């Protein structure tokens, strides 16, 4: 993003945390600006010896090395909850066939079997059953409940 995030004289709008009392946990967000106590003397929000501001700017100039040039980053995390899957791929759906050996895909849950009208009593929230072998034994059709 050198074309966008760099300017003649240096873009310093982008910051990074330089000091912290401990490492971050996964997907932890720390936005605090508390003065970092590097030494034994409490800072009491006053900068000085062993009392530093936790953040620092990036030097983004168009002339900077590719290593020092700005890069825009997007991280996609994919999440399967105790809930229906609402984010699906563009993969088109098809008609449903019963009482035949088929290669089925329900919401990415793939398998091969014979799909039959069940007499199970799923709760309003329950999406798919399992067998003792931790294999899918029954499903709820995403299009038809």
């Amino acid at each position: 993003s050198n074309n966008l995030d760099s300017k003649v004289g240096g873009n310093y709008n982008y910051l990074y945390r330089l000091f912290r009392k401990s490492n971050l946990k996964p997907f932890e967000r720390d936005i605090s600006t508390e003065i970092y106590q590097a030494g034994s003397t409490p800072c009491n929000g006053v900068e000085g010896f062993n009392c530093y501001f936790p953040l620092q700017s990036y030097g983004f100039q168009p002339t900077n090395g590719v290593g020092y040039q700005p890069y825009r980053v997007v991280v996609l995390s994919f999440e399967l909850l105790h809930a229906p899957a609402t984010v699906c791929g563009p993969k088109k759906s098809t008609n449903l066939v019963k009482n035949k050996c088929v290669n089925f895909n329900f919401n990415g849950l793939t398998g091969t079997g014979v799909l039959t009208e069940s007499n199970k009593k799923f709760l309003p929230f329950q999406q798919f059953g399992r067998d003792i072998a931790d294999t899918t034994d029954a499903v709820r059709d995403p299009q038809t409940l």
Partner: nanobody
Amino acid sequence: QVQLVESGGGLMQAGGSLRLSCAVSGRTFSTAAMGWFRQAPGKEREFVAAIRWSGGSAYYADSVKGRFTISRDKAKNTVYLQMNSLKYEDTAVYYCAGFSATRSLLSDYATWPYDYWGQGTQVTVSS
């Protein structure tokens, strides 16, 4: 579209006081800093004082430490230089600066090239 405009310069006798003001329009210096510099005629620009906008921590040149005070009012987007115990040798053009850079270490603002400056206001000390 940002502007620094100084006021408060003038003639004082040695031992007296002056307050400079620099009004900022266009932007804030949130996590970064504002400064005061001076230039005496035919002498090189000199760092005077810097203040971090967020926390209000100050850094001073040795030549002014304990005599000058830098302060800032966020609501008015103004920085102030309180010039106490004025000496012949404080005579200079004083200009405020903005730094867009947030440096972790306050002392860096003594040497860091500023991106914004105002016009300057003349301070003259009588002896």
